[model samples]
Target: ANATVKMGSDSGALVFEPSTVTIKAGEEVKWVNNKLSPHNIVFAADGVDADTAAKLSHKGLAFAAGESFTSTFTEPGTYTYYCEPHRGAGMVGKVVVD
Candidate 1:
């Protein structure tokens, strides 16, 4: 019921390892801090419904090593996201639920 996505890459890049994931509806995805200091998830406003989007976006701003954030995908759809500060650097991720 849960899949893990390391928040930052081991190579010290501004990214999320396994930047893309596929999960079942109602399943959870946990994003854990790994490297590059603080990291958080900012679900894009497009694909997610306004209601779910409200709770999905985070300003966590900082995530100590091993720290993490998790969310359940309530619907079957594509969810795109990126970190607030690193968005420009291509710190993007996606979740596909079926």
Candidate 2:
């Protein structure tokens, strides 16, 4: 990931606008739901041991629509993610940072 993350109006449900966000290590993260229905960005560290990541992820957590959620990632790695309810429909996004 770079050092900045951007998201906004785009052509998709719960779209991340840019659909891709980048931030440096120990930076913060923000997400806004812009789709008709509710969406969430849930993730785990990329390429790490599945069990380890499982313990670290807030797996299956859902955030409602029109809400803003933020988190400060102190861990350094590329985080892979998707909306649990929307992922099957391609409503997926990624935040990469290191």
Candidate 3:
């Protein structure tokens, strides 16, 4: 329940815009879909996702071009995620929740 980190662009291949954000625990992180294509914030290839990811669960449901998906970090840890469409294209991001 602290300051919220803003991900400039949430669309176009699960990009976090800044891609790497630093936030404190109990704070919220919102990825607003700023592109036409939808995106997902699932855990990357690391177990760190279990901390902030599972605690933050907000999927992009029928998000329009300017819609968004948000989640809060209740635990302190690093969260890695990527877009299902662009994961292969190297579209990935990290969230540092402390």
Candidate 4:
């Protein structure tokens, strides 16, 4: 399997399963929903530019179990994201493209 991250934690906490993942440039990362419903990946706007952020983010609220979002990174950088609705609850994630 490639780089895979869970949208929710195993201990039922509001967090990204692994919290972070590292992958090579040109590789793909997959984020799937499991522990919670209605999750989405929205990249933070701090370190990344507008275009790059848009390329790495998704507006899709995955309400169905097993639904996922995948991104192919062609650049090397760290991208941070949070679940829109559960962000305040500590539901956040990061991907490092090397």
Per-residue lDDT tens digits of candidate 3, residues 14-75?
A: 34557677788777766655553444555643555444455464444434644555667666
CA-RMSD of model 4: 1.9
Model 2 pairs in collision: none
lDDT of predicted model 4: 0.76
Choose the strongest candidate by lDDT: 4
**TM-scores of all candidate predictions against the true structure:** 0.86, 0.61, 0.65, 0.85
Comparing 2 and 3 on lDDT, the stronger one: 3
Residue 84 miss distance in model 4 (angstroms): 2.1
Cα-based lDDT at residue 79, candidate 3 = 68
Residue pairs clashing in model 3 are: 1-26
Q: For model 2, what is the C-alpha lDDT against the true structure?
A: 0.53
Among all windows of ten consecutive residues in candidate 4, which has the lowest summed lDDT? 84-93
Rank list by TM-score: 1, 4, 3, 2
| Candidate 4 ranges with C-alpha deviation above 4 Å | none
Pairs with steric clashes in candidate 4: none
Off by over 4 Å in 3: 1-14, 49-52, 55-58, 86-90
Between candidates 3 and 4, name the one with more favorable TM-score: 4
How many clashes show up per model?
Answer: 0, 0, 1, 0
